[PDB]
């Protein structure tokens, strides 16, 4: 199911109380659209309080917002026309309805046409002809100038719907709510900034038309990491996220407090610089390194104590709970034995320690930061490709310039960052793996690959799709492009008091059935 | 029951090294209307059986004996038992004045906090009130003004004063003084002897008083303790021990005393010898080593106490030939003065004008002017070469202040100095350091010139190894100069702070006559050194300035010793050199009614 | 010494407009602003960054970005960090929060430590003297995390055995306190409790050993024995005089203890949850701020310099014989 | 001569009676030359992965549990102290010489020496060296971070010392034997390192002392906040570091390298006292 979360029934459960969370660093801008707004706990806080087109289901399965919209569908789907109902019930904050005004000034402030808004991401506005008023106005008609697959992700997901007002001009969008959100739609409003305590308080929406929450209130409160576990253990916060075993154990002995788990959508992955110049710029020396690395034992003891059965995460564009998830790396499997025959069969021989091609020792540079939570994979790999015979000294960077002065200059031989899931993956491939993206740190790409992936986000099939995500994803490993070595887990150790919160991996809570248990 | 009772006394600091048995075995008692004096040779204990009654002896003392204030046994008493009679009944004025006070309290604060200990209902505006009283009474000049001076803005004299009245701030039952009298002058000591003898009649209390200087006793005292190498060694009256003393070692003391009625030279008679180890003290008398009388029985036993005449104790075994003859009959050894002098009048000091000014201030932060004190005032010295010149006057009149006028080798504040030819102020900074090669200075307080943390050897040596003096003429020169003195060998490895007092005075001494140099400025040289060893200083000194041709600034307060070797003297009161002149004209007639005063004033040796 | 005013507040303000001119510089040149951009999985468009670096500068040369910043840093304008908020307000309400997180917690252990120092200095080598210098090595051979952790875990244990929570130590008030004007402060004085014992502890262990240094030297000397000889206990003798003497070299440690640790807290208002000036200088520099550095090094300069003049004023008043100032 | 001895001859013999501080100095270089001669004897080295046994008790085969990763933690912390001990040692030797020269001749002289030596002090103390020390040290692993680690510890950890020795020596120097030594024509390095700095000396010991432990400390206050020696080389601090999260978990990871930091410490001090009481004359204990 790839949730826990202890569902259990809202009507059963206490009709008040105060859940309160932490976030790492009190939010500069307010707006999620924004560069300085985005984020991942800034935007799951926002969840509770703005419109959401669909709710994605525990595997990324996707269902319209009955709260908000009637019925969202795919028209006429020669250019691709989609029409947004709205239902006649939701206001905003300061009592205006939502219109398809919200929906066309939105799609307009993020499709890129006008260069003052500072926007986080397109997210497929770019591709958007025109917004007209359907029948009437709580009625939107989006057309698209070319097909798009992944439409249902526009206001789905990490992306909202924001008001006609707080999306209409640049100045509003940059600066409108630099200190304090704007009018909210949704089961809950921000009704206290605290900014000398850093702490933000959520009450109950009064003019929220749909399911009544059980909460009373949600307070989040701005703690380090080293301040998140001594509080949660005395009736603080009541929960947090253990993302060690150390923090594991700890929250585990605690008395009153049970650790739920559920797969994350991010993850881990060595990056290979194939560009002209550095070692691997030839196909067959990356897919012969990668041959002679274990990622199963990298998986394995990196994820020690988290979970039973640690395993690699195998697909570059699904994680495991995803649907259309499967293994595709049996191009790479680990067998070292070949590695050492296609590295004979190479060039670089066997010199007493490591391998020589002529004189040039096959030696690689690993370049990873935050050396202390990713140093268990750099060893780990270097010991497993010393029995092969190559080098791969570790360079640990500090983590202030990392991707400045080394990455996207082309600095390196192996990178190991970390990329993020998507119940929406479809519109960060044209960009992560395309020859000409901007996040292609390491120029390695093909015409072919290019052309796929602008063959799957243009099939209005949504099993089509996956179908072609998976010829992309086995293309590109069957280059080297990378190796995705672990996504993480989602151990969240919350008090066992509370009720249908906790680990939901790529899926999304309600919030008007989360709540304390009778008694 | 006897006001004091001691009994068995024995003291033995236990250092690194050999303990030093400072004490062994004495006994004496004090009465409430008498005052007993403890005269004897430096470094015979006289200073640590002063501390074992008190009881503020180091941690290491191992003080084994008996002593009884009023039937109360106070040798093993808790501290707070002993903080009762501390400042009621038992008040001590300490050797050394300098140390003595706490460097961060004003003195007014000092002696109000000595009399609010005992009185805690008095307060701070009447405590403070009547400290000033005290301050007036013993005779500190300007004492409102000067109740607010941090010890290190005060005279020597009047630092000394400050502790005198400390002591007599309560009123206490006994009064143990040691050498309650050697920066003050003769007029200034004269009522602080009468105040003392006020503390007698007025009140009980009893005085035990030690003293390097005899004509003190023959005035105040009522009985005396010549005590020498740890024990008692004669007692008797005071009128009776001064003119039928019959212990060898007395009778070799109470005749080396200056008489006043000398001329330049009068080499004066030392007795002849040096002071006993104090560790090692082989059988018998100690005195036997230096006797005249000395027989091999006298090695045999250590003599007692006995009884010779009606209250008089001699520990001696022959006394009977001591009996009726005179120093001269029984040390056959004779002084003459038959040196190679050296006679000339080329100048080698000229200060013309000097002048000193001090600010006075109040306050713990703004620091608020309330007057000033002019301590020179315009004074004139001349000092040829191979001549003496003596200062005397006034404590707290300037004598101290322009000798490191001239010493600090710079321009002064309005006047002119010229030392060797150079005007002072003519000098830059490598002809300054290498003109101060042949000029030198004994400080007042010897203790306080000399740093803690060197032992002996390195106190004496360091000027003559800034100088360039290899190790093997380093250590001959050394090992002469700690002879000299009278110190011993094995002494080097000490650090200054475990000497008797009068020794850490020779070890400034013996630091100053290092390098020999052309000009030596005295500062009250022989102050803490009893009769017998101050005068086989003053014959060398004497005798190494006729050869060599040394000329020494000599400021003291004993106008009988500046009888013996000054050409020169040069009177100074309140800061302005009241009388000057050859040392004939001015000891014979002086001819202003300051120093006629000083100079009636001194106080006569004979008893009668 | 009105005369020394007028030298040292010049002598004083030329130091700080050059510190806070080399600060500003040298994190212009280390500083990359625009990384965090870039460590983020939706990597925005290079447009929509490239026009980022034109908005905040960062294009200009740095002694123009210098003189534009003092040009209205003189009138209050510290300026903004990266993500628009001001940098003046922010200063004020962080250096509000390290006051109120430090002041009881270093006198108090200043006082500790110079009290434990002192009595390890009477009784040198005795099982009092032993026992206290072990203590203060081992807690200052130990991270500051580890003494406070500890602490957390002996005030858990002190709330489960209890039955009630007596121990709240996270934040600085109760989330969610509600009436009362005495029930504020309750409030305040028992979130204090820890986060306050953390830093005495640390304060009393450095300062013992100096104290204890410090009182050595004055222990044998001799106005005590004369201070003794005045009445006064050994006790007393010991504090009112020797103590006294001895607190001359201690004067500039305390000075510098008034400045220094307020951005060197940080650890404390980790665990703790408190947020000002050791929070805030690895925020400047993790997040590549030379706003925040620049505005930040002014304030700690104006105090780093104000106590080099109570220092000197300290020194003269606590001993008399240092006629200097 | 007959038999005289200098002043440094008796503090020699004084420091060497005190029995404490001689076996105290004895361990303090014997475990220096056991983190050198022991990582070539031992079973298991430094960085040899064991997946077998992540995270385990000590034992028998791994005399002090393993970590993480399954590295051996006895062989791991001898190699951290072989980095951390050196650069502790040098930090407080260069620290207290340069508080002790600045703050001695700047107090002694006073007039423009002290006024220009306070101010650089007062530079040197009002610009954040904690930048300088975040951003510099991680750059390079080799003995050139070591280096430039000590230059900017030794350099930025020196002033507040430096203020505390002026203080004391604008009090010494209006001593009378001070006075005294420049009236006999003691040149003024002669007077400072002869008297000035033996009276003194009871403060820079403890500073030396001090400092050991602070400056092993101070690199792993920087590998809290991310800065610091980087992964693939182990130093003393980085693995207290690591081990100050898994303190209560896992105990054996934070302890035994933190028993060694207690210990060096502990040494360092019984050392310090012992010469402190040599330097003193009026010390109790030796008097015997
Ligand atoms: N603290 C000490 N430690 C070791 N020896 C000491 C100490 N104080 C005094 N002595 C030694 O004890 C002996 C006598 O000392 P004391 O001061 O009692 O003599 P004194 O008769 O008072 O001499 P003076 O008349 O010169 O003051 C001397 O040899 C001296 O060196
Ligand atoms: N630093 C100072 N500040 C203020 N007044 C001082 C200072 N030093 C000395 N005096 C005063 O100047 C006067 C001169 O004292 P000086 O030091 O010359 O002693 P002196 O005349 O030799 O006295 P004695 O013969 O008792 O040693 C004294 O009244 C003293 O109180
Ligand atoms: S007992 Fe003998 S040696 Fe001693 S003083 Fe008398 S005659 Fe001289
Ligand atoms: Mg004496
Ligand atoms: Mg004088």
Known sequence: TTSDINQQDPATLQDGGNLRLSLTDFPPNFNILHIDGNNAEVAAMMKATLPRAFIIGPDGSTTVDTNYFTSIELTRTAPQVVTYTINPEAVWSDGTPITWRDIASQIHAISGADKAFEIASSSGAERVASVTRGVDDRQAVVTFAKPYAEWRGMFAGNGMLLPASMTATPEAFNKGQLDGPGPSAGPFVVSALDRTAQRIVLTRNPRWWGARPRLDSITYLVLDDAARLPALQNNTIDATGVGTLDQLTIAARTKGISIRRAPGPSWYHFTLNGAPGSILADKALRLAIAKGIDRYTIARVAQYGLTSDPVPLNNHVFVAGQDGYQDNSGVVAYNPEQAKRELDALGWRRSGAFREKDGRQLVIRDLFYDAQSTRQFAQIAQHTLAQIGVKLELQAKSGSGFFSDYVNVGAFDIAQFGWVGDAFPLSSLTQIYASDGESNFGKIGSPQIDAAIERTLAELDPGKARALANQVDELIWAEGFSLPLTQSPGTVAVRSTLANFGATGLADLDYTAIGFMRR | ?608 | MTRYLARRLLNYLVLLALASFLTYCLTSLAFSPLESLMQRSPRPPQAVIDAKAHDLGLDRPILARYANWVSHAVRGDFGTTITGQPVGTELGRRIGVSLRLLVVGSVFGTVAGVVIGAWGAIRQYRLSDRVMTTLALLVLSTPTFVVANLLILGALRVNWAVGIQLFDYTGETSPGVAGGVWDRLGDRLQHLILPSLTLALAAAAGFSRYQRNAMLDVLGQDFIRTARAKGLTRRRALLKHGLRTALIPMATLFAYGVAGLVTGAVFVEKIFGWHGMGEWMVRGISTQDTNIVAAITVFSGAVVLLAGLLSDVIYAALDPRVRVS | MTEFASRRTLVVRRFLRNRAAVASLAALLLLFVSAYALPPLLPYSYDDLDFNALLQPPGTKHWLGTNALGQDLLAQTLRGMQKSMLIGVCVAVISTGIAATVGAISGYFGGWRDRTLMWVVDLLLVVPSFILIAIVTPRTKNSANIMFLVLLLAGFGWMISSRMVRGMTMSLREREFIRAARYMGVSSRRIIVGHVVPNVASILIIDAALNVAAAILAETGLSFLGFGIQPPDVSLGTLIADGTASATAFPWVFLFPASILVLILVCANLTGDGLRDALDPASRSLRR
């Open chain 2, 1 to 608: 029951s006897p006001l004091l009772e001691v009994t068995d006394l024995a003291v033995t600091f236990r250092t690194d090294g050999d303990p030093v048995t400072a004490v062994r075995g004495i006994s004496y008692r004090v009465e409430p209307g008498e005052v007993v004096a403890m005269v004897g040779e430096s470094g015979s204990g006289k200073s640590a059986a002063a501390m074992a009654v008190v009881g503020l002896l180091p941690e290491y003392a191992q003080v084994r004996g008996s002593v009884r204030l009023q039937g109360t046994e106070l040798l093993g008493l808790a501290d707070n038992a002993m903080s009762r009679f501390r400042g009621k009944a038992i008040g001590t004025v300490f050797q050394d004045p300098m140390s003595a006070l706490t460097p961060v309290y004003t003195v007014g604060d000092q002696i109000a906090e000595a009399i609010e200990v005992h009185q805690p209902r008095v307060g701070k505006k009447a405590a403070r009130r009547r400290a000033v009283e005290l301050l007036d009474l013993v005779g500190i000049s300007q004492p409102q003004r000067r109740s607010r001076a941090f010890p290190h803005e005060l005279s020597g004299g009047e630092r000394q004063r400050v502790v005198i009245a400390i002591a007599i701030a309560n009123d206490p039952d006994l009064l143990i003084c040691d050498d309650p009298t050697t920066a003050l002058d003769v007029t200034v000591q004269a009522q602080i002897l009468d105040v003392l003898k006020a503390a007698r009649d007025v009140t009980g209390a009893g005085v035990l008083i030690i003293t390097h200087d005899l004509g003190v006793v023959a005035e105040f005292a009522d009985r005396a303790l010549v005590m020498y190498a740890g024990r008692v060694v004669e007692s008797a009256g005071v009128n009776d021990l001064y003119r039928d003393r019959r212990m060898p070692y007395t009778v070799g003391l109470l005749g080396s005393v200056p008489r006043l009625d000398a001329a330049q030279g009068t080499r004066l008679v030392p007795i002849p010898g040096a002071p006993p180890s104090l560790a090692g003290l082989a059988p018998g008398c100690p005195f036997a080593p230096r006797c005249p009388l000395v027989i091999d029985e006298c090695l045999t036993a250590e003599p007692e106490l006995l009884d010779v005449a009606t209250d008089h104790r001699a520990a001696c075994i022959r006394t009977e030939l001591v009996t009726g003859r005179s120093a001269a009959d029984i040390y056959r050894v004779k002084t003459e003065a038959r040196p190679a002098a050296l006679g000339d009048a080329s100048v080698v000091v000229r200060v013309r004008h000097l002048v000193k000014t001090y600010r006075l201030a109040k306050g713990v932060v703004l620091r608020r002017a309330i007057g000033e004190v002019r301590a020179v005032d315009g004074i004139s010295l001349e000092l040829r070469q191979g001549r003496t010149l003596g200062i005397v006057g006034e404590s707290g009149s300037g004598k101290s202040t322009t000798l490191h006028e001239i010493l600090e080798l710079a321009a002064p504040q309005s006047g002119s100095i010229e030392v060797l030819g150079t005007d002072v102020a003519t000098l830059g900074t490598a002809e300054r350091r290498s003109l101060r090669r042949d000029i030198q200075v004994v400080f007042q307080d010897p203790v306080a010139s000399l740093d803690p943390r060197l032992p002996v050897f390195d106190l004496i040596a360091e000027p003559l190894q800034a100088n360039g003096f290899g190790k093997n003429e380093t250590h001959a020169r050394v090992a002469e100069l700690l002879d000299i003195v009278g110190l011993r060998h094995g002494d080097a490895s000490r650090y200054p702070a475990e000497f008797s007092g009068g020794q850490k005075q020779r070890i400034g001494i013996a630091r100053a006559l290092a390098l020999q140099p052309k000009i030596l400025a005295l500062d009250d040289p022989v102050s803490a050194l009893d009769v017998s060893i101050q005068a086989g200083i003053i014959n060398l000194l004497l005798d190494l300035q006729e050869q060599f041709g040394l000329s020494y600034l000599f400021v003291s307060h004993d106008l009988s010793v500046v009888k013996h070797l000054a050409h020169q003297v040069a009177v100074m009161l309140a800061g302005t050199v009241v009388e000057q002149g050859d040392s004939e004209e001015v000891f014979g007639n002086p001819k202003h009614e300051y120093t006629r005063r000083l100079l009636g004033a001194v106080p006569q040796p004979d008893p009668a």
